[PDB]
Amino acid sequence: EPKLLAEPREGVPNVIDTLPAFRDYCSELASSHGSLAADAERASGFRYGHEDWLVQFKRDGAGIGLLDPQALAAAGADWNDFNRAVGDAVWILHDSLQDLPGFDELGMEPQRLFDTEIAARLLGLKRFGLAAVTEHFLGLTLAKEHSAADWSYRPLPRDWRNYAALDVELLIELETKMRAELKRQGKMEWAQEEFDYALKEGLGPRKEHLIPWMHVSHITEVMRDRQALAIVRALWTRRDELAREYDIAPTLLLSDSSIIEVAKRKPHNAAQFRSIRSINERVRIHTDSEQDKMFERYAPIQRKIKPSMWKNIIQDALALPPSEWPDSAPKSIRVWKERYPERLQVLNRVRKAVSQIAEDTRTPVEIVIKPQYLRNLCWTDEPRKRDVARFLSEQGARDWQVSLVAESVSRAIEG
Ligand code: NA
Ligand code: NA
């Protein structure tokens, strides 16, 4: 019988956006005990990247702090005061890989971690979002209503502040119940190793894929044509510069459809450019929601970038010498099956061995060990010459994963 928690017990907090209010909250954090419940909000889909537009904390006695990073930077707040106030306290985060890069970028230094998402997965929780996890362990429902908000909106509305507060409101109580359960399932040291690793990986700049410009939707329709790819490259790059400069989501400045369209058509002049309508008109987000007015706020920034700016870029791309145009295991089992059936036979023996361990320990198979590490291991015509335990370790698997898995995997490979 879950109960809806509509507001925090202490009420909806005011935003901390002045230097005195920051120094006050830091003092209260210094005066408090136990773990630090943490979270962050970002204006994804609206602003450029993954800059935090809100930062949320709770500590027993200090209560909930909703901290405005941009206002506090302008007020000249020192985030090192925060670190000194908190010390080596445990940070509780749900999916810590999301918020640790942003915390690191503000200059915060979490020294210990409890990841409630990581813990839920190890425990075998099949739906592991915050709301599903707190209902499972605390019998309390959070109505997650303002998840896709533009967190750059000032002043922050009371409902949004309430959402942001509710996201740190139950994390210390979550940790307590989930530690007790991990210990009883005998997974507490597995948990700890996964926290250690997440803090190592997350606290630092976030992962960007190998070649960013290649991630334009429908790019495959243009991959045979290297001059089109030079156009896609050039357009993506300039769009990325201007999106960062003007602090706006890149696809609000120029759609992927427009990029692919002009890469196909290759307009050589101004009249040829004007015939392509999409690149001459402002991007319009239509979702038939209250969100439409929220995107429409960015129209004056969108209008600041003119069609002519893309026209110049297409010219540059088309003036490139042809010799300057651009061109571990496959994740797709189809590729394995079609091209390397003998390697796949070995992999399938490995996969069923890892699945068996998943069952016997009641841990999701992808959590037991990262599926890609097993694929990389079997991506060879000499699988019996693998030092399984060492290879898996060098891949980035944790000691507990190697100790649980490697011998049985070695046996499966041998047959
Ligand atoms: Na988050
Ligand atoms: Na959140």
Short mmCIF file of C-alpha atoms and ligand atoms in Angstrom, two decimals:
data_model
loop_
_atom_site.label_atom_id
_atom_site.label_comp_id
_atom_site.label_asym_id
_atom_site.label_seq_id
_atom_site.Cartn_x
_atom_site.Cartn_y
_atom_site.Cartn_z
CA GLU A 1 0.00 0.00 0.00
CA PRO A 2 2.27 2.85 -1.25
CA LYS A 3 1.56 6.43 -0.15
CA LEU A 4 2.05 9.47 -2.39
CA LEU A 5 4.59 11.91 -0.97
CA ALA A 6 3.43 15.23 -2.48
CA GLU A 7 5.94 17.51 -0.70
CA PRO A 8 9.01 17.13 1.58
CA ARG A 9 8.39 16.83 5.33
CA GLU A 10 10.14 20.16 5.91
CA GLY A 11 8.19 21.83 3.10
CA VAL A 12 9.20 23.26 -0.27
CA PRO A 13 12.59 25.03 0.11
CA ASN A 14 13.55 28.42 -1.31
CA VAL A 15 16.39 28.48 -3.80
CA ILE A 16 19.84 29.41 -2.47
CA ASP A 17 21.15 32.03 -4.90
CA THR A 18 23.03 34.55 -2.73
CA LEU A 19 26.46 34.40 -1.05
CA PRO A 20 25.09 34.79 2.53
CA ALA A 21 22.52 32.01 1.96
CA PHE A 22 25.29 29.77 0.59
CA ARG A 23 27.61 30.39 3.58
CA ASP A 24 24.63 29.67 5.85
CA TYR A 25 23.80 26.32 4.24
CA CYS A 26 27.48 25.29 4.31
CA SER A 27 27.55 25.97 8.08
CA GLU A 28 24.43 23.83 8.55
CA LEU A 29 26.06 21.07 6.49
CA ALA A 30 29.16 21.33 8.68
CA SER A 31 26.94 21.05 11.74
CA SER A 32 25.15 17.96 10.38
CA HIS A 33 25.76 14.19 10.60
CA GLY A 34 25.52 11.15 8.32
CA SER A 35 25.32 10.98 4.54
CA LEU A 36 24.77 13.69 1.93
CA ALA A 37 21.74 13.12 -0.30
CA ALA A 38 22.65 14.69 -3.67
CA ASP A 39 21.19 15.44 -7.13
CA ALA A 40 21.37 17.92 -10.03
CA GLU A 41 19.09 19.32 -12.70
CA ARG A 42 20.07 20.27 -16.24
CA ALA A 43 18.31 22.01 -19.10
CA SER A 44 18.88 19.20 -21.64
CA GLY A 45 17.04 19.67 -24.93
CA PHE A 46 17.03 23.43 -24.23
CA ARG A 47 20.53 24.71 -23.36
CA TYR A 48 23.79 23.58 -24.99
CA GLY A 49 25.20 20.68 -22.97
CA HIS A 50 25.03 19.21 -19.49
CA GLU A 51 25.69 22.24 -17.31
CA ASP A 52 23.81 22.05 -14.02
CA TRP A 53 21.12 24.72 -13.65
CA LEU A 54 20.27 23.41 -10.18
CA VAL A 55 22.03 21.38 -7.51
CA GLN A 56 20.12 19.66 -4.67
CA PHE A 57 21.38 18.53 -1.26
CA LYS A 58 20.04 17.14 1.97
CA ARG A 59 21.75 16.36 5.25
CA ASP A 60 20.03 15.45 8.54
CA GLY A 61 19.65 18.74 10.42
CA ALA A 62 20.65 21.03 7.57
CA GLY A 63 17.57 20.08 5.56
CA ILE A 64 17.20 20.56 1.81
CA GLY A 65 19.36 23.03 -0.13
CA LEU A 66 18.42 23.94 -3.70
CA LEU A 67 21.48 25.73 -5.01
CA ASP A 68 21.49 27.97 -8.10
CA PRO A 69 25.01 27.41 -9.59
CA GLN A 70 24.91 30.36 -12.05
CA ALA A 71 23.73 32.91 -9.47
CA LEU A 72 26.26 31.58 -6.93
CA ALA A 73 29.13 31.81 -9.43
CA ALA A 74 28.10 35.46 -10.04
CA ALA A 75 27.86 36.00 -6.26
CA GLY A 76 31.41 34.61 -6.03
CA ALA A 77 30.59 31.55 -3.94
CA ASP A 78 33.54 29.24 -3.30
CA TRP A 79 32.56 25.59 -3.80
CA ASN A 80 35.58 24.63 -1.68
CA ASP A 81 33.62 25.88 1.36
CA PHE A 82 31.12 23.15 0.50
CA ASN A 83 33.78 20.40 0.41
CA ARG A 84 35.19 21.49 3.77
CA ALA A 85 31.68 21.57 5.24
CA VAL A 86 30.87 18.03 4.00
CA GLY A 87 34.30 16.41 4.35
CA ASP A 88 34.55 12.69 3.64
CA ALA A 89 30.80 12.10 4.00
CA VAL A 90 29.03 9.58 1.78
CA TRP A 91 27.27 11.11 -1.20
CA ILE A 92 24.02 9.35 -2.13
CA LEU A 93 23.26 9.60 -5.83
CA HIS A 94 20.81 7.71 -8.05
CA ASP A 95 22.79 6.80 -11.20
CA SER A 96 25.95 8.63 -10.19
CA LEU A 97 27.49 8.65 -13.68
CA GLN A 98 24.93 11.34 -14.60
CA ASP A 99 25.73 13.94 -11.90
CA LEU A 100 29.38 13.30 -11.00
CA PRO A 101 30.87 15.03 -14.08
CA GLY A 102 28.89 18.22 -13.34
CA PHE A 103 29.77 18.14 -9.63
CA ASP A 104 33.45 17.69 -10.57
CA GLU A 105 33.15 20.64 -12.96
CA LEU A 106 31.87 22.92 -10.18
CA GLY A 107 34.87 21.87 -8.07
CA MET A 108 33.08 19.52 -5.68
CA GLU A 109 35.03 16.52 -4.38
CA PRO A 110 32.85 13.56 -3.24
CA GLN A 111 35.07 11.20 -1.24
CA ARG A 112 32.63 8.32 -0.78
CA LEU A 113 29.58 7.14 -2.75
CA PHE A 114 26.44 5.12 -2.36
CA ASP A 115 24.72 4.73 -5.72
CA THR A 116 21.06 3.79 -5.16
CA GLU A 117 20.65 2.82 -8.81
CA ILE A 118 23.71 0.55 -8.80
CA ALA A 119 22.56 -1.05 -5.51
CA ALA A 120 19.01 -1.61 -6.86
CA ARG A 121 20.38 -3.43 -9.95
CA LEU A 122 22.67 -5.70 -7.89
CA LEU A 123 19.61 -6.46 -5.71
CA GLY A 124 17.82 -7.53 -8.88
CA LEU A 125 15.36 -4.63 -9.23
CA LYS A 126 14.10 -4.83 -12.80
CA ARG A 127 12.70 -1.27 -12.82
CA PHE A 128 15.36 0.87 -11.24
CA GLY A 129 14.32 4.49 -11.68
CA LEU A 130 14.15 6.61 -8.51
CA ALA A 131 10.35 6.37 -8.16
CA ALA A 132 10.25 2.53 -8.56
CA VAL A 133 13.13 2.11 -6.06
CA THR A 134 11.67 4.33 -3.30
CA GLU A 135 8.25 2.65 -3.67
CA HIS A 136 9.86 -0.79 -3.35
CA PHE A 137 11.89 0.02 -0.23
CA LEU A 138 10.00 2.82 1.56
CA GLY A 139 6.43 2.36 0.27
CA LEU A 140 6.43 5.98 -0.89
CA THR A 141 5.42 7.28 -4.33
CA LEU A 142 7.07 10.26 -6.03
CA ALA A 143 5.05 11.73 -8.93
CA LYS A 144 7.98 12.61 -11.19
CA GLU A 145 6.25 15.50 -12.98
CA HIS A 146 8.95 18.06 -13.92
CA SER A 147 11.71 15.79 -15.27
CA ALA A 148 11.87 17.35 -18.76
CA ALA A 149 11.73 20.97 -17.55
CA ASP A 150 13.93 23.79 -18.78
CA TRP A 151 15.91 24.17 -15.54
CA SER A 152 17.41 27.45 -16.78
CA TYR A 153 14.04 29.17 -16.18
CA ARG A 154 14.34 31.94 -13.54
CA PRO A 155 12.73 32.36 -11.10
CA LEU A 156 12.18 28.64 -10.51
CA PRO A 157 8.44 27.88 -9.97
CA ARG A 158 7.28 26.36 -6.67
CA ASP A 159 6.23 23.03 -8.28
CA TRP A 160 9.70 22.61 -9.85
CA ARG A 161 11.45 23.46 -6.57
CA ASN A 162 9.19 20.82 -4.99
CA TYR A 163 10.21 18.22 -7.61
CA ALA A 164 13.90 19.02 -7.10
CA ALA A 165 13.55 18.80 -3.32
CA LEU A 166 11.61 15.51 -3.49
CA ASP A 167 14.47 13.97 -5.51
CA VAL A 168 16.91 14.24 -2.53
CA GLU A 169 14.20 13.93 0.20
CA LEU A 170 14.37 10.12 0.61
CA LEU A 171 17.94 9.21 -0.37
CA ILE A 172 19.39 8.84 3.16
CA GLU A 173 16.49 6.53 4.11
CA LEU A 174 16.95 4.67 0.82
CA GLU A 175 20.65 4.03 1.53
CA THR A 176 19.83 2.66 5.02
CA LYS A 177 17.25 0.08 3.79
CA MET A 178 19.33 -0.83 0.73
CA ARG A 179 22.52 -1.40 2.77
CA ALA A 180 20.61 -3.73 5.11
CA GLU A 181 19.28 -5.66 2.09
CA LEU A 182 22.66 -5.82 0.28
CA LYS A 183 24.22 -7.23 3.47
CA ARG A 184 21.46 -9.83 3.79
CA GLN A 185 21.84 -10.80 0.10
CA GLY A 186 25.62 -10.91 0.67
CA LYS A 187 26.28 -8.33 -2.07
CA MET A 188 27.62 -5.44 0.10
CA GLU A 189 31.26 -5.75 -1.03
CA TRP A 190 30.10 -6.07 -4.66
CA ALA A 191 28.15 -2.84 -4.07
CA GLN A 192 31.17 -1.09 -2.51
CA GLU A 193 33.44 -2.06 -5.48
CA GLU A 194 30.82 -0.76 -7.91
CA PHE A 195 30.67 2.54 -5.98
CA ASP A 196 34.47 2.88 -5.91
CA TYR A 197 34.56 2.38 -9.70
CA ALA A 198 31.63 4.73 -10.46
CA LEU A 199 33.28 7.51 -8.43
CA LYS A 200 36.57 6.91 -10.28
CA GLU A 201 34.87 6.93 -13.72
CA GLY A 202 32.27 9.63 -13.08
CA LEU A 203 34.29 12.27 -11.23
CA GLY A 204 35.86 13.86 -14.31
CA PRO A 205 34.74 15.02 -17.80
CA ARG A 206 31.95 12.94 -19.41
CA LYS A 207 32.35 10.39 -22.20
CA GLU A 208 31.98 11.73 -25.72
CA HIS A 209 31.77 9.19 -28.57
CA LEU A 210 34.71 8.62 -30.91
CA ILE A 211 33.59 10.80 -33.82
CA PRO A 212 30.79 13.18 -32.66
CA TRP A 213 29.70 14.60 -36.07
CA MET A 214 28.82 11.10 -37.29
CA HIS A 215 25.84 11.10 -34.89
CA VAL A 216 23.44 13.01 -37.13
CA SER A 217 20.20 11.05 -37.52
CA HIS A 218 19.67 9.39 -40.94
CA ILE A 219 23.43 9.71 -41.67
CA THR A 220 23.38 6.21 -43.16
CA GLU A 221 21.44 7.53 -46.18
CA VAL A 222 24.52 9.60 -47.07
CA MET A 223 27.42 7.27 -46.05
CA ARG A 224 28.22 6.19 -49.64
CA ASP A 225 28.85 9.84 -50.54
CA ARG A 226 32.04 11.26 -49.00
CA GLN A 227 31.36 14.80 -50.30
CA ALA A 228 27.99 14.66 -48.52
CA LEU A 229 29.85 13.46 -45.44
CA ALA A 230 32.18 16.47 -45.75
CA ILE A 231 29.04 18.66 -45.78
CA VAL A 232 27.58 16.87 -42.73
CA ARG A 233 30.94 17.26 -40.94
CA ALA A 234 31.18 20.98 -41.76
CA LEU A 235 27.54 21.72 -40.80
CA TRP A 236 27.69 19.73 -37.54
CA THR A 237 30.89 21.54 -36.55
CA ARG A 238 29.65 25.08 -37.16
CA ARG A 239 26.28 24.26 -35.54
CA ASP A 240 28.20 22.99 -32.48
CA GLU A 241 30.31 26.17 -32.19
CA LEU A 242 27.27 28.45 -32.42
CA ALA A 243 25.23 26.27 -30.07
CA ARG A 244 27.96 26.53 -27.41
CA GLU A 245 28.49 30.26 -28.01
CA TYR A 246 24.76 31.03 -27.80
CA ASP A 247 24.07 28.40 -25.08
CA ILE A 248 21.30 26.47 -26.86
CA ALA A 249 20.64 22.84 -27.88
CA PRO A 250 22.34 22.35 -31.31
CA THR A 251 19.21 20.90 -32.97
CA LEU A 252 17.28 24.07 -32.16
CA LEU A 253 19.68 25.98 -34.43
CA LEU A 254 19.61 23.50 -37.30
CA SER A 255 17.83 20.17 -37.68
CA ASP A 256 19.48 16.89 -38.70
CA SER A 257 16.94 16.60 -41.56
CA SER A 258 18.18 19.94 -42.98
CA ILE A 259 21.83 18.81 -42.69
CA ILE A 260 21.14 15.49 -44.49
CA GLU A 261 18.91 17.28 -47.05
CA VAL A 262 21.59 19.79 -48.09
CA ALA A 263 24.30 17.10 -48.06
CA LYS A 264 22.20 15.15 -50.57
CA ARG A 265 21.26 18.14 -52.71
CA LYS A 266 24.54 20.12 -52.52
CA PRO A 267 23.34 23.70 -53.27
CA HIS A 268 26.10 25.50 -55.22
CA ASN A 269 24.54 28.96 -55.07
CA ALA A 270 22.04 31.18 -53.21
CA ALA A 271 19.03 30.33 -55.44
CA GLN A 272 19.80 26.62 -55.03
CA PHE A 273 19.97 27.13 -51.26
CA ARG A 274 16.60 28.91 -51.13
CA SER A 275 14.90 25.97 -52.89
CA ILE A 276 15.58 23.93 -49.72
CA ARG A 277 12.93 25.27 -47.35
CA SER A 278 13.91 23.54 -44.09
CA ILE A 279 17.34 25.26 -43.88
CA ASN A 280 15.76 28.69 -44.62
CA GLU A 281 13.23 28.48 -41.79
CA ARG A 282 13.51 28.49 -38.01
CA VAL A 283 13.35 25.10 -36.27
CA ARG A 284 9.92 24.65 -34.65
CA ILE A 285 9.35 22.15 -31.86
CA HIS A 286 5.76 20.91 -32.04
CA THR A 287 4.66 18.42 -29.37
CA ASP A 288 1.13 19.85 -28.83
CA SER A 289 2.10 20.46 -25.16
CA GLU A 290 2.89 23.21 -22.65
CA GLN A 291 6.50 22.43 -23.66
CA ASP A 292 5.95 24.20 -27.00
CA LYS A 293 5.78 27.63 -25.32
CA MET A 294 8.88 26.62 -23.33
CA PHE A 295 10.92 26.00 -26.50
CA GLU A 296 9.48 29.13 -28.16
CA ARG A 297 11.41 31.20 -25.59
CA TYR A 298 14.54 30.36 -27.60
CA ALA A 299 13.17 31.93 -30.81
CA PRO A 300 15.18 35.20 -30.46
CA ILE A 301 18.40 33.13 -30.27
CA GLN A 302 17.25 30.99 -33.21
CA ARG A 303 16.56 34.17 -35.27
CA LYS A 304 20.09 35.41 -34.46
CA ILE A 305 21.54 32.68 -36.66
CA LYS A 306 20.69 33.31 -40.32
CA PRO A 307 20.40 30.88 -43.29
CA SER A 308 23.35 32.68 -44.95
CA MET A 309 25.67 31.31 -42.24
CA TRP A 310 24.88 27.74 -43.26
CA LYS A 311 25.16 28.69 -46.96
CA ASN A 312 28.79 29.83 -46.41
CA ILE A 313 29.59 26.54 -44.65
CA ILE A 314 28.19 24.45 -47.53
CA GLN A 315 30.40 26.50 -49.91
CA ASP A 316 33.50 25.71 -47.79
CA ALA A 317 32.63 22.01 -47.64
CA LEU A 318 32.16 21.88 -51.44
CA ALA A 319 35.51 23.67 -51.96
CA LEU A 320 37.37 20.87 -50.12
CA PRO A 321 39.87 18.74 -52.07
CA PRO A 322 38.47 15.17 -52.45
CA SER A 323 41.52 13.87 -50.54
CA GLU A 324 40.19 15.66 -47.43
CA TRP A 325 36.72 14.08 -47.40
CA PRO A 326 36.22 11.62 -44.52
CA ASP A 327 35.52 7.89 -45.10
CA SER A 328 36.92 -4.63 -30.13
CA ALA A 329 34.02 -6.93 -31.09
CA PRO A 330 30.83 -5.98 -32.98
CA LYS A 331 27.84 -5.62 -30.63
CA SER A 332 25.54 -7.14 -33.27
CA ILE A 333 25.12 -10.94 -33.02
CA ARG A 334 24.02 -10.86 -36.70
CA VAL A 335 27.60 -9.90 -37.69
CA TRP A 336 29.03 -12.69 -35.49
CA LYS A 337 26.57 -15.25 -36.94
CA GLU A 338 27.07 -14.30 -40.60
CA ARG A 339 30.85 -13.77 -40.64
CA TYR A 340 32.38 -15.67 -37.66
CA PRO A 341 30.10 -18.61 -36.71
CA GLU A 342 32.97 -20.45 -34.98
CA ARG A 343 33.71 -17.46 -32.72
CA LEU A 344 29.95 -17.23 -31.95
CA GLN A 345 29.79 -20.88 -30.79
CA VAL A 346 32.44 -20.05 -28.17
CA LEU A 347 30.63 -16.81 -27.21
CA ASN A 348 27.30 -18.59 -26.78
CA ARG A 349 28.95 -21.10 -24.41
CA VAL A 350 30.38 -18.09 -22.49
CA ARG A 351 27.00 -16.28 -22.51
CA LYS A 352 25.12 -19.30 -21.11
CA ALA A 353 27.79 -19.69 -18.40
CA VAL A 354 27.40 -16.04 -17.37
CA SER A 355 23.57 -16.39 -17.51
CA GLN A 356 23.75 -19.42 -15.23
CA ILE A 357 25.73 -17.37 -12.66
CA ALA A 358 23.20 -14.53 -13.03
CA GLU A 359 20.40 -16.97 -12.05
CA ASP A 360 22.27 -18.64 -9.17
CA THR A 361 23.13 -15.26 -7.61
CA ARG A 362 19.89 -13.48 -8.71
CA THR A 363 21.80 -10.61 -10.33
CA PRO A 364 20.90 -9.24 -13.81
CA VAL A 365 23.24 -10.78 -16.41
CA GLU A 366 24.42 -7.37 -17.66
CA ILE A 367 25.31 -6.39 -14.05
CA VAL A 368 27.27 -9.65 -13.34
CA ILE A 369 29.72 -8.48 -16.03
CA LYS A 370 29.46 -6.00 -18.95
CA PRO A 371 28.24 -7.92 -22.04
CA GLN A 372 30.85 -6.19 -24.26
CA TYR A 373 33.77 -7.59 -22.22
CA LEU A 374 32.63 -11.17 -23.03
CA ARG A 375 32.27 -10.24 -26.71
CA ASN A 376 35.77 -8.71 -26.77
CA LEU A 377 37.14 -11.89 -25.08
CA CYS A 378 35.62 -14.22 -27.68
CA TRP A 379 36.62 -11.93 -30.58
CA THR A 380 39.52 -14.19 -31.50
CA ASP A 381 40.32 -17.38 -33.42
CA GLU A 382 42.42 -18.49 -30.42
CA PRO A 383 40.02 -18.26 -27.42
CA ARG A 384 41.75 -21.05 -25.48
CA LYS A 385 44.93 -18.93 -25.32
CA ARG A 386 43.14 -16.19 -23.35
CA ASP A 387 44.09 -15.52 -19.77
CA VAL A 388 40.39 -15.03 -18.95
CA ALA A 389 40.84 -13.54 -15.47
CA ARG A 390 43.54 -11.10 -16.69
CA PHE A 391 41.83 -10.14 -19.98
CA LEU A 392 38.58 -9.37 -18.15
CA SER A 393 40.41 -7.30 -15.55
CA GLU A 394 42.29 -5.32 -18.26
CA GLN A 395 38.88 -4.70 -19.92
CA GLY A 396 37.75 -2.88 -16.77
CA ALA A 397 35.77 -5.56 -14.92
CA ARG A 398 35.86 -5.37 -11.16
CA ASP A 399 37.63 -7.87 -8.91
CA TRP A 400 34.32 -9.34 -7.68
CA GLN A 401 33.12 -9.86 -11.27
CA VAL A 402 36.37 -11.60 -12.23
CA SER A 403 36.34 -13.78 -9.08
CA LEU A 404 32.71 -14.78 -9.70
CA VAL A 405 32.93 -15.33 -13.43
CA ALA A 406 36.39 -15.99 -14.88
CA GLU A 407 36.90 -19.69 -14.07
CA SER A 408 33.47 -20.76 -15.29
CA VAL A 409 34.00 -18.66 -18.44
CA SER A 410 37.45 -20.28 -18.93
CA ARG A 411 35.75 -23.70 -18.65
CA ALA A 412 33.03 -22.73 -21.16
CA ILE A 413 35.69 -21.56 -23.66
CA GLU A 414 37.57 -24.86 -23.30
CA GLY A 415 34.34 -26.83 -23.67
NA NA B 1 19.99 12.90 -11.66
NA NA B 2 16.54 14.54 -10.71
#
